[PDB]
Amino acid sequence: LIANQFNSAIGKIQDSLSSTPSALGKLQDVVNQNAQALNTLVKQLSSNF
Amino acid sequence: LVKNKCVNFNFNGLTGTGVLTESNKKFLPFQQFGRDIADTTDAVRDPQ
């Protein structure tokens, strides 16, 4: 019973990761934040100052 | 024009410095040059 429950839990984790798109929230947020910082730094050249 | 060599280029007043290669990307007839997501030129249509 415990082995079956563990296997079902692992499969459910796989299915939830595959279905839910916002699961990787922290990593996606850090990547997007770093990319946005770089993009704003690059766009800062067009500033007239 | 020189390709695959780092050369300062001037196409229709672009005055950009870089290396030139044949690009697979397509351009509309009126469009003359392309820009990146960071507002930096990345492709030029040759006027000649």
Binding site: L24, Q28, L38 | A38, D42
Partner: peptide, 22 residues
């Protein structure tokens, strides 16, 4: 989970293959 104006992105010391091996 999903050009250069003086910037550069140095590759990580441990590649994804090596991290997967770990």
């Amino acid at each position: 989970v999903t050009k250069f104006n003086g910037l550069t992105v140095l590759p990580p010391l441990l590649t994804d293959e090596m991290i997967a091996q770990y």
